[PDB]
Design a protein around this ligand. Sequence first.
Ligand code: ADP
Ligand code: ADP
Ligand code: ADP
Ligand code: ADP
Ligand code: MG
Ligand code: MG
Ligand code: MG
Ligand code: MG
Lengths: 183, 183, 183, 183, 183, 183
Amino acid sequence: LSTAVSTLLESGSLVTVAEQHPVTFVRNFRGLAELLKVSGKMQKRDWKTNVHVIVGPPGCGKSKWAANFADPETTYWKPPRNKWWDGYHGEEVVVIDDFYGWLPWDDLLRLCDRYPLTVETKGGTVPFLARSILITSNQTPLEWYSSTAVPAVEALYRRITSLVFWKNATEQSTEEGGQFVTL
Amino acid sequence: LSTAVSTLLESGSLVTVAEQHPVTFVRNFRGLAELLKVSGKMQKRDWKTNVHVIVGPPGCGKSKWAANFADPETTYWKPPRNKWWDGYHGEEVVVIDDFYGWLPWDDLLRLCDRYPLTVETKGGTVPFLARSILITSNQTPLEWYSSTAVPAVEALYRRITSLVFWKNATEQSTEEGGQFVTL
Amino acid sequence: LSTAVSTLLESGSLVTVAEQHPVTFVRNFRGLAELLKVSGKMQKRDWKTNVHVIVGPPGCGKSKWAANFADPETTYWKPPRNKWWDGYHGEEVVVIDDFYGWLPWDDLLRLCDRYPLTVETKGGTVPFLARSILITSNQTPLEWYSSTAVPAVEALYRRITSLVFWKNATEQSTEEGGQFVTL
Amino acid sequence: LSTAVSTLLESGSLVTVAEQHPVTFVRNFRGLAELLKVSGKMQKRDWKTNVHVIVGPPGCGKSKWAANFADPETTYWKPPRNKWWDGYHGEEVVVIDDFYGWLPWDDLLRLCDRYPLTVETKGGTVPFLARSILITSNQTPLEWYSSTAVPAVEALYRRITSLVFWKNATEQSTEEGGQFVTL
Amino acid sequence: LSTAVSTLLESGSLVTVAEQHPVTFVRNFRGLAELLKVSGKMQKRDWKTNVHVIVGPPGCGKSKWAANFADPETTYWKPPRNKWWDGYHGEEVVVIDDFYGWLPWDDLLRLCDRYPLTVETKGGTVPFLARSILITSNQTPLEWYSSTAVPAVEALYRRITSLVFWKNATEQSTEEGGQFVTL
Amino acid sequence: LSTAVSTLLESGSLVTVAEQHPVTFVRNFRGLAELLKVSGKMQKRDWKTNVHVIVGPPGCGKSKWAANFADPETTYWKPPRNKWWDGYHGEEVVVIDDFYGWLPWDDLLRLCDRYPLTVETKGGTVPFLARSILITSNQTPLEWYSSTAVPAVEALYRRITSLVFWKNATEQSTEEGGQFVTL
DNA sequence: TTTTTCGATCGATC
DNA sequence: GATCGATCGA
Ligand SMILES: Nc1ncnc2c1ncn2[C@@H]1O[C@H](COP(=O)(O)OP(=O)(O)O)[C@@H](O)[C@H]1O
Ligand SMILES: Nc1ncnc2c1ncn2[C@@H]1O[C@H](COP(=O)(O)OP(=O)(O)O)[C@@H](O)[C@H]1O
Ligand SMILES: Nc1ncnc2c1ncn2[C@@H]1O[C@H](COP(=O)(O)OP(=O)(O)O)[C@@H](O)[C@H]1O
Ligand SMILES: Nc1ncnc2c1ncn2[C@@H]1O[C@H](COP(=O)(O)OP(=O)(O)O)[C@@H](O)[C@H]1O
Ligand SMILES: [Mg+2]
Ligand SMILES: [Mg+2]
Ligand SMILES: [Mg+2]
Ligand SMILES: [Mg+2]
């Protein structure tokens, strides 16, 4: 057990213990969770999460690019139209699928921001630790939200790291700066 | 329970652990759930779901062919008019019966894609891993939703793998699929 | 101990497990319940549920007849005018009393079919396994809905098994069914 | 454990026990928290939680200053919009970030008082012990709550300690409550 | 633990057990509390609970009079805005602070009576026994509740034992009951 | 513990196990209750439970008489606006006080019926062995449950044992006859 | 168990 | 004026 406590308290979250000594995590699982939350070393997020938007008409292999962006061991495909992040437990790359505007504006800002955040799950809370949010969508970011119900739409475009677009060509071409508002 | 952990991390289904090991699942039943949920290795969808729309006027055995699709056991029946996939627990056949369009259009566009998804249950979420969604109905897929209310709009009529109509009180004739927009 | 699981897998009921081996049921009770709930498939239904409609002028001794169909201890008396079948555990007389057109049309058509359904309580879902539905009403089954709002429109009468009527202060007469639209 | 309980009863803080001998805190973690609740040595608040308010248009570095106010080992970043102080098991700094009024008025009045408070966590209760509440906002404290729908707007202002404001696109300058409705 | 059970049987207070033998109280705390509940030697209430009401404009110093009143160690500052009394576990100042009616009417009548009452926590129920309640407000009690939406509002004023006011920027001059309404 | 089950499964549970075997009940307290509930030996009831209903404006000693009815040792007070019957681990006066209609009507009837019942507490279920329910109110007993919201108002009337109104501010008088819809 | 989640009320838009 | 959606409270 002190081995499990070593691998937990020294560094990481419960996932590393689950990968190191499972037989000591099937037992004492609630107490490792409370030790982690009380020790204070529960991993915050102190980095910048890249945000790659993808735009294209339905059928252009949008989601294929997302599923091929990283290994399926480290992709959390967020369920749609919910505020719940259930099952996450840290999964580096987060692909918000086909996102037409079904997330609160300030919450979308805070996912794409660069400072700690704890997202919510059904009956608990899980610390957000993503590193590349792939926002697969259908329209340009200028049609997700309306300027009426938003403080300032620039506050989101400031965070879109890259932006792949689909034009009348079988390839998907990145966007060099902004023809529209700059990112 | 050393064998139980090594068997759980490979098959990734608690039912298999219980069946292959009754005794060590009576104890540590919660811990195995948390180990599965945290370690990863949960069975996620990475295949294509095969939609089989069945359509005809009432009383023609729409449901008869729905439950005919083997087995009578491994067939989740989606609760009507609702959002929650409660109690699903992992099946392979999902028979949405007597459809009108009650599932939101985007959720139906997403049930029939080729990528992981997480459905909602009243108290959590359960991974959705289905291989055929028998959408029994009464109308053709053209009039499930209003012509203007759908914004895509040809993203459902792509993924409809099969189709069966009901002709003039004679038999269920497999629709050839060419007359309508292609499938 | 080990023999508890041996006696559970050959019973299918916890009651005998408690009777024969109580000492190891005072401990480990939570796990036998989970084992039964996870190793035994949920109970579907495949039996046409008889729908005996009771209709007459008000106050004609309808409720007493309803309770007299079967044992009152296994009879539900569904909370009227809402959509929460508060469990009730599966109780296999169902008496919807004073029905006058408030359940949705397709929901009622589904409640009286040969294929499984799952009505929902507040905070969960209960499998619906009814051998008899006793629709006690006030007026004719054709006045429950108008043919404009119902695009079926004669699909209910297939599901009605028989009909019970009260003639001009003679008795609760059992209908022929051959004069009006057939049963 | 026989010594761990001795430390717990006289240190009065579960964090101390969790850091001294984690292994006997992994087991018996409910027990220690319940002994601490019963014995009465659970830590209250009797000091004044000095509240810093930061204002300025987005992207000007409000959040960076908030992460540079204290060590990241202690700053608890409040989860947004959802009134659940989960992940808190103490220590001084609390940075409610990007505030716009998403907290009930009385709770914002009562966090900043000098007297004990217990906040909700997801299935429990955590005592509040902060020493600095850095509220970060884009709007002056006037536009957080409407004057008419508030019993007395002067109550919140009395509890603000410092007010830092961004001016003229060069650098944020501390205010003294002259121009603002003073505190 | 036989000594601990016997020393609980006659004293009937978990506080005493936790004072004498913490170690046993750490390991089995649900057991001792349930044993105390079942044996019937709980602590019912048979005494009128004084309700001192303080009214004044904010900043006049209402709450400092509550914070100094009985003892810093035997006051339970009620968590606001909700019906949970967690962590209370005995005794006898209960100071509902900053009140304006955010507690259910019948429950507020019932807190201020002579007959027993069990109050609700996150995990179970802890018996209520308060020798004096201090209620702090900004309005007079005449407008804590809608005078129309309450059947008989005299039943609250009858329970207040002392209604202490704030005069014209001088002091907290105790008002005399029965003049303006009953007391 | 072997003898514990033998004593448990005779009668009069769990009060007599807790009296006779204090040590073995500190452990296994959830499991003895579960074994007893599973077996058909929860000391059931066949006696029509008495219902005394009191009506009078507040301050007229409604609840005083309820307190002065039986021995306080064997009295339970139902905490209002709360469907949990925690504290029923003794019995047999039940005084639902200060009623305004806050119980589900069918359950209220079920408490006043003759059949055996099992109410649910925080941590399982408890048999409802009541003999006298002193339903104390302040308004006319009819208005508690609206006739539209109830299938039959007279069903509640049938199980009332006795009723008491209040006189012209002097006396408690027993109501005799058919001033309202009698039983 | 609590949480849910569900239901009711209020506000805004057509 | 009615229906649907969103937000808040329990
Ligand atoms: N494992 C796979 N095997 C074969 N083809 C695949 C696989 N994964 C993706 N594809 C192809 O990628 C395409 C994805 O299309 P689809 O997901 O419907 O559109 P979008 O990706 O834009 O949502 C399909 O046409 C399919 O042929
Ligand atoms: N480690 C770092 N190295 C260089 N620049 C940094 C570092 N951390 C933060 N910054 C800068 O500080 C700024 C903080 O931005 P942000 O937190 O969005 O401001 P606010 O939250 O107030 O809108 C970023 O623009 C970034 O360039
Ligand atoms: N350090 C201090 N110096 C001077 N006055 C103080 C200090 N701390 C608190 N007070 C005074 O104590 C009183 C009570 O504080 P508080 O309870 O927060 O206000 P309220 O009575 O409105 O709830 C206030 O009037 C405040 O002016
Ligand atoms: N020891 C006592 N001394 C004086 N009066 C008492 C005592 N015990 C009970 N009472 C009286 O009993 C009455 C209870 O009535 P009330 O509080 O109106 O009941 P409820 O609030 O439940 O309707 C009070 O008026 C109170 O004066
Ligand atoms: Mg897609
Ligand atoms: Mg910020
Ligand atoms: Mg105060
Ligand atoms: Mg009363």
